[PDB]
């Protein structure tokens, strides 16, 4: 069984912060010591899930628990190159039938990672960054002739410039 439990970080914080801190004696670290969502899930326990809504009888049937970390800027770059089902290779094959080559420089990948993390969506929120940039290019790519290769620069992701096109 698996499902992203939304709001599980707030309940765990009460158990680990231990204090409101409106008094003189009580310590207050609002943002300096603020809990990290990744680390927090590692500290989960069955008693925390009871507050969420799960029944103890249900959790007892599932003793093992697996906590997953959030995506990182470095991890997103590997997702586009190492996996065979990466989105970069998908578009590469989309244009291969059309007789056109596709390229993706490293300068563009670093910019895409920063834009994806801000969306707070994960790997699934990456296509919005790619297809939104290559919209104009894809719209007029079939009409164009003698085009054999396409290059996407960092500026293309920012939107300041357009993707350079090559002619065979």
């Amino acid at each position: 069984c698996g499902g992203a439990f939304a709001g599980l970080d707030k309940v765990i914080s009460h158990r680990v912060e231990t204090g409101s801190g409106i008094g003189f004696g009580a310590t207050v670290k609002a943002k300096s010591d603020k809990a990290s969502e990744g680390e927090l899930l590692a500290q989960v326990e069955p008693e925390d899930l009871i507050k969420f809504g799960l029944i103890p009888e249900f959790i007892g049937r599932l003793p093992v628990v697996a906590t997953l970390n959030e995506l990182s800027e470095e991890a997103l770059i590997q997702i586009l190159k190492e996996p065979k089902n990466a989105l970069t290779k998908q578009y590469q094959a989309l244009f291969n039938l059309e007789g056109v080559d596709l390229e993706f420089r490293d300068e563009a990948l670093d910019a895409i990672a920063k834009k994806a993390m801000a969306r707070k969506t994960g790997a699934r929120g990456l296509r919005s960054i790619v297809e939104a940039a290559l919209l104009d290019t894809m719209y007029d790519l079939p009409s164009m002739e003698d085009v054999e290769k396409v290059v996407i620069d960092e500026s293309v992701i920012d939107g300041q410039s357009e993707p350079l096109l090559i002619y065979g």
Binding site: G7, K10, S20, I22, G23, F24, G25, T27
Partner: protein
């Protein structure tokens, strides 16, 4: 006027007055003269916190020039009756009765600000009538004076003879002297 604040909770947003927000965190304010109405209000706050949690410390901030004696003794007996440790802090000034509730806090959880000031004197009174009635009210206020000195010695640790001499007239005690006198435990200069 009292400012309103918003306490962000999982259920939703709620609007609270500044005094009510601190009450939720086991914090009570003792401001102005000690009277029957103000004293009876603080007692209900302590009892409410006892039922909600009997193991969490309560904090009592005192800034008062004193007042009625009978109104103040109701608070002292309540603090000793309940199980939670009533922490006391002196802000601005602590007169005769304000000082008695200050030292009456739980041992080890009594503090005084670096610039706070404590003042102690004997009970005040008066009566007008027949000589037989004056003798009665004189014996009663004498018992209170003796009773107030006995309890002061118990929490401060000093001897009863010392309290009698020091309370004959007004005596001001700075924040450092209060620690040496056993009235408080330490000073909250900075937040560490």
């Amino acid at each position: 006027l009292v400012p309103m604040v918003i306490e962000q909770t999982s259920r939703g947003e709620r609007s609270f007055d500044i005094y009510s927000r601190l009450l939720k965190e086991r914090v009570i304010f003792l401001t102005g003269q000690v009277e029957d109405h103000m004293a009876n209000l603080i007692v209900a706050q302590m009892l409410f916190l006892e039922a909600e949690n009997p193991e969490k410390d309560i904090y009592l901030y005192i800034n008062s020039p004193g007042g009625v004696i009978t109104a103040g003794m109701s608070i002292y007996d309540t603090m000793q009756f309940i199980k939670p440790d009533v922490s006391t802090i002196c802000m601005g000034q602590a007169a005769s009765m304000g000082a008695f509730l200050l030292t009456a806090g739980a041992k080890g959880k009594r503090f005084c600000l670096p610039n706070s000031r404590v003042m102690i004197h004997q009970p005040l009174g008066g009566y007008q009538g027949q000589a037989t009635d004056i003798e009665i009210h004189a014996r009663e206020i004498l018992k209170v004076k003796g009773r107030m000195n006995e309890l002061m010695a118990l929490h401060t640790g000093q001897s009863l003879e010392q309290i009698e001499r020091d309370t004959e007239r007004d005596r001001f005690l700075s924040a450092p002297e209060a620690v040496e006198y056993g009235l408080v435990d330490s000073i909250l200069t900075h937040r560490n």
